[PDB]
Amino acid sequence: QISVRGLAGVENVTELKKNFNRHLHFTLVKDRNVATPRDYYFALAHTVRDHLVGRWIRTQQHYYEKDPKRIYYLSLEFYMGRTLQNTMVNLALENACDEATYQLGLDMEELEEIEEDAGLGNGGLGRLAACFLDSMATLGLAAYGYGIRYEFGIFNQKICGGWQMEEADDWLRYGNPWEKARPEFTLPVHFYGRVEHTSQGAKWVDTQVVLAMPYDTPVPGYRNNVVNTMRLWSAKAPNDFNLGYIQAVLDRNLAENISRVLYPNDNFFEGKELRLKQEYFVVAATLQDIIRRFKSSTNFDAFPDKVAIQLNDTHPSLAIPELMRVLVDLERLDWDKAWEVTVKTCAYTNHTVIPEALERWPVHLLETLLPRHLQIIYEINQRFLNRVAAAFPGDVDRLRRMSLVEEGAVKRINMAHLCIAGSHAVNGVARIHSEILKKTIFKDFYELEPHKFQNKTNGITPRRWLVLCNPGLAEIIAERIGEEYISDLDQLRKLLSYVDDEAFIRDVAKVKQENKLKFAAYLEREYKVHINPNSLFDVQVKRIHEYKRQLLNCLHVITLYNRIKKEPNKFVVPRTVMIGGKAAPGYHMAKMIIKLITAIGDVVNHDPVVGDRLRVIFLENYRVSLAEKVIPAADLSEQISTAGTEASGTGNMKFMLNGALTIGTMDGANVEMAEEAGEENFFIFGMRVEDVDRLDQRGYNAQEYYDRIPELRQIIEQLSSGFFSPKQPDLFKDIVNMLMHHDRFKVFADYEEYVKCQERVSALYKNPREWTRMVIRNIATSGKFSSDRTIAQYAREIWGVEPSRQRLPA
Amino acid sequence: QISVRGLAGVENVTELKKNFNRHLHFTLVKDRNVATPRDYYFALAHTVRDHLVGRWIRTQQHYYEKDPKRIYYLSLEFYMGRTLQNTMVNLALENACDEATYQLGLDMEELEEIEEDAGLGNGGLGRLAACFLDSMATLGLAAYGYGIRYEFGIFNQKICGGWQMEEADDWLRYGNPWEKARPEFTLPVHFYGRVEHTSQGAKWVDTQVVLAMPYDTPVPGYRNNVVNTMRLWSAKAPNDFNLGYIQAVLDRNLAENISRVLYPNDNFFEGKELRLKQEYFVVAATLQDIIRRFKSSTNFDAFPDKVAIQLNDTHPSLAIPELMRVLVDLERLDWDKAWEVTVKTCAYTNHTVIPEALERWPVHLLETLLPRHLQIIYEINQRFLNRVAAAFPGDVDRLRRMSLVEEGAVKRINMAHLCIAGSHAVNGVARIHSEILKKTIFKDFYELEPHKFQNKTNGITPRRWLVLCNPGLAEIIAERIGEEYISDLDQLRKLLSYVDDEAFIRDVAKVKQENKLKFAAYLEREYKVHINPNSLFDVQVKRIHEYKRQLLNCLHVITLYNRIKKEPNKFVVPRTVMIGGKAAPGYHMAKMIIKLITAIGDVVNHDPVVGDRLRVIFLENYRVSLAEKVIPAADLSEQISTAGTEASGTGNMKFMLNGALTIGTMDGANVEMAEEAGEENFFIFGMRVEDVDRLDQRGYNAQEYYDRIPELRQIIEQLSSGFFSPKQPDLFKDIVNMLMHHDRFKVFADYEEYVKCQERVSALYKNPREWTRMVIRNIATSGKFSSDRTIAQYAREIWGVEPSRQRLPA
Ligand SMILES: [N-]=[N+]=N[C@]1(C(N)O)O[C@H](CO)[C@@H](O)[C@H](O)[C@H]1O
Ligand SMILES: [N-]=[N+]=N[C@]1(C(N)O)O[C@H](CO)[C@@H](O)[C@H](O)[C@H]1O
Ligand SMILES: *Cc1c(COP(=O)(O)O)cnc(C)c1O
Ligand SMILES: *Cc1c(COP(=O)(O)O)cnc(C)c1O
DSSP states (O other): OOGGGOOOOHHHHHHHHHHHHHIIIIITOOOTTTOOHHHHHHHHHHHHHHHHHHHHHHHHHHHHHHOOOEEEEEOSOEEEEOOHHHHHHHHTOHHHHHHHHHHTTOOHHHHHTTSOOEEEOOSHHHHHHHHHHHHHHHTTOOEEEEEEOOSBOSOEEEEETTEEEEEOOOTTTTOOTTOEEOGGGOEEEEESOEEEEETTEEEEESOEEEEEEEEEEEEEOSSSSOEEEEEEEEEEOOTTTTOOHHHHHHTHHHHHGGGTBOOOOSSOOOOOHHHHHHHHHHHHHHHHHHHHHHHTOOOGGGHHHHEEEEEESSTTTTHHHHHHHIIIIISOOOHHHHHHHHHHHEEEEOOOOOGGGSOEEEHHHHHHHOHHHHHHHHHHHHHHHHHHHHHSTTOHHHHHHHOSEEOSSSOEEEHHHHHHHTOSEEEESSHHHHHHHHHTTTHHHHHHOGGGEEEOOOOBOTIIIIIITOHHHHHHHHHHHOSGGGGOGGGGGGGGGGTTOHHHHHHHHHHHHHHHHHHHHHHHHHHOOOOOTTSEEEEEESOOOTTTTHHHHHHHHHHHHHHHHHSTTSOOOOEEEEEEOOOOTTOHHHHHHHHHHHHHHHHHTTOTTTTTSEEEEEETTOOHHHHHHHGGGOSEEEEOOOTTTOSOOSHHHHHHHTTOEEEEOSOTTHHHHHHHHOGGGSEEOSOOHHHHHHHHHHOOOHHHHHHHOHHHHHHHHHHHHTTTOSSSTTTTHHHHHHHHHOOTTOHHHHHHHHHHHHHHHHHHHTSHHHHHHHHHHHHHTOGGGBHHHHHHHHIIIIIOOOOOOOOOOO | OOGGGOOOOHHHHHHHHHHHHHIIIIITOOOTTTOOHHHHHHHHHHHHHHHHHHHHHHHHHHHHHHOOOEEEEEOSOEEEEOOHHHHHHHHTOHHHHHHHHHHTTOOHHHHHTTSOOEEEOOSHHHHHHHHHHHHHHHTTOOEEEEEEOOSBOSOEEEEETTEEEEEOOOTTTTOOTTOEEOGGGOEEEEESOEEEEETTEEEEESOEEEEEEEEEEEEEOSSSSOEEEEEEEEEEOOTTTTOOHHHHHHTHHHHHGGGTBOOOOSSOOOOOHHHHHHHHHHHHHHHHHHHHHHHTOOOGGGHHHHEEEEEESSTTTTHHHHHHHIIIIISOOOHHHHHHHHHHHEEEEOOOOOGGGSOEEEHHHHHHHOHHHHHHHHHHHHHHHHHHHHHSTTOHHHHHHHOSEEOSSSOEEEHHHHHHHTOSEEEESSHHHHHHHHHTTTHHHHHHOGGGEEEOOOOBOTIIIIIITOHHHHHHHHHHHOSGGGGOGGGGGGGGGGTTOHHHHHHHHHHHHHHHHHHHHHHHHHHOOOOOTTSEEEEEESOOOTTTTHHHHHHHHHHHHHHHHHSTTSOOOOEEEEEEOOOOTTOHHHHHHHHHHHHHHHHHTTOTTTTTSEEEEEETTOOHHHHHHHGGGOSEEEEOOOTTTOSOOSHHHHHHHTTOEEEEOSOTTHHHHHHHHOGGGSEEOSOOHHHHHHHHHHOOOHHHHHHHOHHHHHHHHHHHHTTTOSSSTTTTHHHHHHHHHOOTTOHHHHHHHHHHHHHHHHHHHTSHHHHHHHHHHHHHTOGGGBHHHHHHHHIIIIIOOOOOOOOOOO
């Protein structure tokens, strides 16, 4: 047992054991003679869950009595991952449960691997919402996460013949012990219908009703006895729905399809009706719940003082016109009063600037599905543009640029413009991203209302991303500076005075080595793959995207291979290059990149001359639980997006906190990370944002790089001739064609500096002691990237509430 | 507290209370400050459920150790109703729970009303399966009920404007505390595909796979610590199903629709593909489970010694060719050996002779959906007909009459012929029905294999149908003869010596009066209806069918009304005529009969001259839980089906056990009931089966009755002129037209004798003491109709197992 995992008290281990047996018997209805590891996992889950309820009930009763300002975090994604270990950590039950299960003759680690990941997210945005919930509970905020309970989360990725295959993520198959259905709080959500304009007000009539049933999941704070709630809505058809008879009952599934599956698109907008329905569904049900709770705390003037609604991207942007609809149509507030309340209540967070991710809904869709909302949006636009016109007289082009309504082929509603107009605060997720918003994408809006624009650099929770996934590192750190850093990451600074400590250097390096061995093992257990634990672990894990430039990584891998074949008997630092991540099902290029990766592995991993000096592995089904395994085992973190494309990134922070050195561009949060640790302790390379713009003025011509770089030329010719695809020589023609003629991300432009920088990485890896000292400098300055810091800033600068580290009663 | 409800021990009431609070807190995650009656209901349900698990686990472990012959009852319907009270009764926990909830300040009766009925049945057949499960557990048989877990059971009936409106029965909305999902025992079920004939055997290939997930529900025996299992299969799509991406996931619902809803047809065959899929689904999954269990007890010669499969009607008839398919195709047994095993394993129960209920599946359907099964069926037919030909040389018409394959418009498979050929026993459900089977419908089969044909008169469980729904009557009976009768109904005979006991007569009458007051109250509480508790309660509750002749009842009601209007100031015994029951959604005539009933009520209930002398009420949404309320309150039980159409009936038995006198035809079980009680203690009338046949030889002409009976003529003319439908004068033209020209059930032919008999009923009701004495004679001789007797006969004469009343350890 390690200290950070809590006490294994005599009374509590005994108590845990009997409750474990009580659940195995009464809850699972099994005896030890027929129980399987899955049954044991559930008995433990229910036992741990029991320890939450008491705190869950009093935390909620507490907010009712004290009635503080409530924070409502709206998101269509909550990438939670597993819940068992996280709950034990936050409740200081890990050692006790470890001991109790040991005495019962069970391996707790084995049982934890049985829990299904709650993959209700695509990547960064979804995981961010998960970390935020953890931090809000840890900071004692009366916060509620509101989303959709998808029956099927992000698809499970299978690699067949080197190609990605998708398969339904039936995560609820065996049940979810963490959620509590609350059918008694079901709410109606309306769709379609039409608008009637009577004397005293407008009415939305003849609508189709879909019921929203909530499921509450507890969110425990870190050892503070606070347990907040994540409420996920599930779609249910009313019983007089479609109510020949048999068909009517079977068609109920049409309404319930709303919460059936998560759209697997990462940073890509798909204007499908089902998606719009999901967006309104979560917004409509959530706002009724919010108002309900407010009325039970009718002057809505105090609404903004008791309520804060954070829009995680534009996905829940309809909350703005829906709030107006309720206040104006139902509560009968005058427009101006309602608008004042709405603006002071809502705050919007922008997560990316790439055009293809921007939500622009066709007017004909809103027209049919949400007719009243379209009218309200036009009215908002009208009044907003009148403000612009009055502020910039005669600037007609500004008017059309700022309109919420876009003209052209088909009229569309720019949801981002909607969010800015209806929110009192708009923030980017990293300093460079937030500046870009003010200088480019939202320049006009910044000029009209500069006070609205802020920055809130993303963060990650040190509980899941350090204590839970890397207990070995958390321990040696605790041995030196104590445990307070877990909820006050800035304290990692104190580790700076141990940078020359021989014992510490040895331990940091030991923990990393153990993590690598453990992962190298896992690799062979669950995926029959052998790798060399002494090689440098070069990993790039994140969603497959052209802007993330996994292709640039591929070019380097091929460069290393060609250099070896050129001078076989020359020494080179051994490397295990790991690339993982899912591609959206309809993203052809992303799928081709995955195939290219496996194809490279096919050649490189079986070339006798290469030996154990270079291995290319594609990490299958990258998800939260897998991230918890690879990140602690990584030596090199690849964050190589084209400058200006990765708003922030969060994977980068996870790697920094876990002892990996970072090679990357001055993009997103990488800029602040290098700033915190010192550029000398970072492997920075490539074009800066300014260089990218210069190149665009000039005109990006990939041919130029192809002509001046022999090594690069050789790689393109290998791809083109079928060197990596013998049976299908032209298999990668699309990739080559894109790289050569329409590469929006300038892969070639950063190639030279990238491989040069990679050489410096290998040189430092050859000096174990200095590599580790640089690692210590990174870990020691990663404190700023704790989501506790991020949330404390949202709380003070946007929501107007004070965080608190006070422990609620037992 | 009453004695039959068990002891309210000090230690147990205290234990019940803390467990109730434990579940309210830990299971429901609620505090007393926000708990609602529904929450309290669930805390109690979970508390009671806890007492079952221990016994459930040891009963099953017990069967594993002793390895007795297993009884598998296959049914597409299990009309369970509520489970809470039934479980308390069988566990002797009712008084303890009553006391415990009282001390917690709660009314247990109020909480019981919150439980949703498990309406996985249409009527008789489904309820029979429910009573059988209870009796099998009570008789200590290693029995398993196998069916489908429909998401939506029989529809909830609403009456709008006097018309039936159907609405989804979302019985799982708030959850089901009684079931235990067993995803770990999921089994694959195949559909479509084609048949490949290789060297060593035929193969069913290229099939579509649907997963069958089981849900186990405990079935407690009466105070014997035996808890059997009812396993209901749920359809689940495999995860690589349909696996653009979004659509594939959404289409998963196509496979899962198999267990979505119960076909609401009572005694009516609808040849829909979805229905056939349900039938094979339950059969395929069940047989794999059966074999699996057998192999874990490979000579299948002992299979019939360890396994008995009872086919509840022909719905699960595919079990015969499916068993053959597995034994021949998979286990590789020779045809003849496999057939021997199949016949000795299967037994079939026929429930009705009406042609429209007979399952005749089109060959093109089986051809596409189950190609291998069709081949096996042809092979079975071939070999069966060769036996017929050898037994009746030259009788060519017999060959075509007995074929499993019917020629004509479209070829069809007669599933009933299939069941007879592949079963070692075939039984009817009442003596007269079973005789009819041998003399008519299955005469040819009886001639070929007389040994196969048996009778097993239906029964009802005295636990739910006496102790649970009529505790007052069970008590006064127990006060005289003890409690042993509850599991040995024949003991009610002893009540015969109390027929002249003044105290008993007074009590029997008192209990009935209390039941009537309680129901008259319930009527006003949940349906705003006032009735006179002193009137005779004339009730007919069962599914709406033309053969049940609710119309004959209607004619009598109108006769009574016309007679009153004719001589207003003449005295007549007051009556409250209650008719209830659901009509299949597509059964037009049944729906018109419901409207006619309400229409009569509209006129009769508001005629000042009638006063409180006659009331016509239509009991809305008749279901099991409602039956438990009306039956104990009834004075007169209407069992007036045309002789030869009601195979048995079971409602009739429920009324007899509960103190109601019976007016009915010599049909189904009515014949044995009158035989047991004595015809003098029964109100028998109308044509006997022989009279019906004579009339058919002759030719049924309704006009004749219309011409010779003035009162009948007046009624038809009232219906025709719009007397009961002012706004829509021709509203009942279909009814009149049917009665006059195409009445298959000869309503007019029994009219005269029916009203005459009804007059005798009223005369006896005028003499309270003698009416009650006749009631005692009925209750005292109802013992034979206990499903314990029925099951003991199935056990000994069909399954080859001995029932046992031995109590398993605690
Ligand atoms: N939605 N969105 N965009 C992202 C993402 N999910 O990847 O949001 C994440 C959370 O803000 C950012 O770190 C990331 O750079 C940005 O591209
Ligand atoms: N299926 N079927 N037929 C019936 C029914 N459900 O009503 O089976 C019941 C159970 O055997 C019989 O009592 C009844 O007379 C017969 O019509
Ligand atoms: C943290 C995380 C991400 C975000 O990673 P980036 O490299 O910022 O894109 C995506 N997926 C998972 C499973 C994560 O844990
Ligand atoms: C017993 C019962 C039946 C069968 O009644 P019959 O009069 O034999 O048709 C039908 N429905 C319910 C709810 C029952 O309890």
